[PDB]
């Protein structure tokens, strides 16, 4: 069997010590599921 | 800047930009720099970072697309050029010391010299037709 557990992601950019890191993400679909 | 002594540096992690330098000096101190005789001699001692030299040799041979590997990793600041002057006629001469393949002892930690030296000069004149040829 094969299936997704979880995930994370990141960017290297030194935005500044606490500056506005801001984005959004979603799967459009995991077309195969179940 | 390749001063051969530490220039000043900081970050203030408050705003998004943070870094500054502060200025200090243009030379490594206490090098003889000049001498004279009261007969009117001078020595315009000029002196340059061998590490700057390495970045230059690197940069220029990478402009030659070659893989660079100076066997001297190790910093020191070295004499480089001088002027001399005609005390009465105002003619003068340039002399230049130049070098490549910096080397260091990978076991004894010792300056292993330069593999190649390059040496150059010119007289120069107040003029009136005579061209100098370096």
Curated annotation (Swiss-Prot), chain A:
UniProt PTM: The isolated toxin complex includes 3 peptides starting between residues 768 and 778 of this protein, which might be physiologically relevant.
Superkingdom of the organism of origin: Bacteria
Effect of gene knockout: Cells with a disrupted yenA1-yenA2-chi2-yenB-yenC1-yenC2 locus are no longer pathogenic in C.zealandica larvae.
Subcellular location(s) of the protein: Secreted
Assembly behavior: Semipurified toxin complex consists of at least YenA1-YenA2-YenB-YenC1-YenC2-Chi1-Chi2. The Yen-TC:K9 subcomplex is about 26 nm tall and 22 nm in diameter with 5-fold symmetry and 5 copies of YenA1, YenA2, Chi1 and Chi2; the chitinase subunits may be solvent accessible on the exterior the complex. The Yen-TC:K9 subcomplex has no insecticidal activity. The native complex with additional YenB, YenC1 and YenC2 subunits is 16 nm taller and is insecticidal; the toxicity-conferring subunits are present at about 1 copy each.
Function (record text): Part of an orally active toxin complex (TC) with strong insecticidal effects on larvae of the Coleoptera Costelytra zealandica, Acrossidius tasmania and Adoryphorus couloni and some Lepidoptera larvae. The TC has an endochitinase activity.
The protein's name in its UniProt record: Toxin subunit YenA2
Source organism of the structure: Yersinia entomophaga
Name of the gene this protein is made from: yenA2
Portion of the full sequence shown: 1219 to 1252 of 1364
UniProtKB/Swiss-Prot annotation, chain B:
Top-rank lineage group of the source organism: Bacteria
Loss of function: phenotype: Cells with a disrupted yenA1-yenA2-chi2-yenB-yenC1-yenC2 locus are no longer pathogenic in C.zealandica larvae.
Stretch forming the signal peptide: none
Subcellular location: Secreted
Free-text comment about domains: Residues 389-698 form a 5-bladed beta-propeller domain which closes one end of the shell; the other end of the shell is closed by the RHS repeat-associated core domain in YenC2.
Free-text function comment from the UniProt entry: Part of an orally active toxin complex (TC) with strong insecticidal effects on larvae of the Coleoptera Costelytra zealandica, Acrossidius tasmania and Adoryphorus couloni and some Lepidoptera larvae. The TC has an endochitinase activity.
Family assignment from sequence similarity: In the N-terminal section; belongs to the SpvB family.
Subunit and interaction comment: Semipurified toxin complex consists of at least YenA1-YenA2-YenB-YenC1-YenC2-Chi1-Chi2. YenB and the N-terminus of YenC2 form a large hollow shell of beta-strands. The shell is closed at both ends, within which the C-terminus of YenC2 is probably found. The Yen-TC:K9 subcomplex is about 26 nm tall and 22 nm in diameter with 5-fold symmetry and 5 copies of YenA1, YenA2, Chi1 and Chi2; the chitinase subunits may be solvent accessible on the exterior the complex. The Yen-TC:K9 subcomplex has no insecticidal activity.
Annotated protein name in UniProt: Toxin subunit YenB
Residue numbers of the full-length protein present here: 677 to 812 of 1487
């Amino acid at each position: 069997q094969r299936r997704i557990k979880s995930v994370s992601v990141s960017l290297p950019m030194l935005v500044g010590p606490y500056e506005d890191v801001c984005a959004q993400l979603t799967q459009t679909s995991s077309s195969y599921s179940t | 800047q390749g001063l051969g002594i530490a220039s000043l540096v900081m970050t203030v992690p408050h705003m998004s930009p943070t870094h500054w330098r502060c200025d200090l000096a243009l030379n490594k101190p206490w090098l003889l720099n000049v001498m004279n005789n009261n007969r009117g001699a001078e020595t315009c001692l000029f002196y340059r970072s061998s590490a700057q030299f390495w970045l230059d040799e690197k940069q220029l041979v990478e402009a030659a697309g070659q893989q660079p590997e100076c066997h001297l990793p190790f910093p020191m600041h070295l004499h480089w050029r001088s002027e001399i002057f005609d005390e009465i006629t105002g003619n003068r001469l340039t002399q230049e010391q130049e070098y490549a393949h910096g080397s260091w002892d990978g076991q004894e930690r010792e300056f292993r010299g330069f593999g190649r030296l390059i040496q150059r000069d010119t007289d120069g004149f107040a003029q009136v037709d005579i061209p100098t040829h370096p």
